[PDB]
Design a protein around this ligand. Sequence first.
Ligand SMILES: [Zn+2]
Length: 169
Amino acid sequence: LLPILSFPDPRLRTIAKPVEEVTDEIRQLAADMFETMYAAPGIGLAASQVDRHIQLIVMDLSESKDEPMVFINPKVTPLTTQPYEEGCLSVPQIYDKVDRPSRVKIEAINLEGQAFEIEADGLLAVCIQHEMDHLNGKLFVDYLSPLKRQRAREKVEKIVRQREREKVA
Ligand SMILES: [Zn+2]
């Protein structure tokens, strides 16, 4: 399982590079990203989060863990906000409210290298926007008040340290 970078790691601020071609190394990265995300568990993971700074997002919003979606080189444009309690595998076990445009259009390519365009509302609009932020080196904590940020940071470093401690046990 690929290791997920944790806030405040500076590599999470890297702006991702476009994918040149959907080769079989990015197909294998995507499957490992899904694996990593499904194990967490989470519903979304940007390649930036596993220290591969390319424009790849994996996502599965299904209670069954069997509706997987891929977005390569994505473009997101609002079609107009709504509140939602967001978390992030790179800000582990921290959830808070962020307010994002509630309807968006997504243009991206899939793992066969074909282009698509869809309109998104609901959980889809929140998630795509959250993951596109990762690709621009941004985290959902950047929209919270700074006392919630250093507090999330102190909790995360604790959580990272326990996870290290759990591996020694
Ligand atoms: Zn995230």
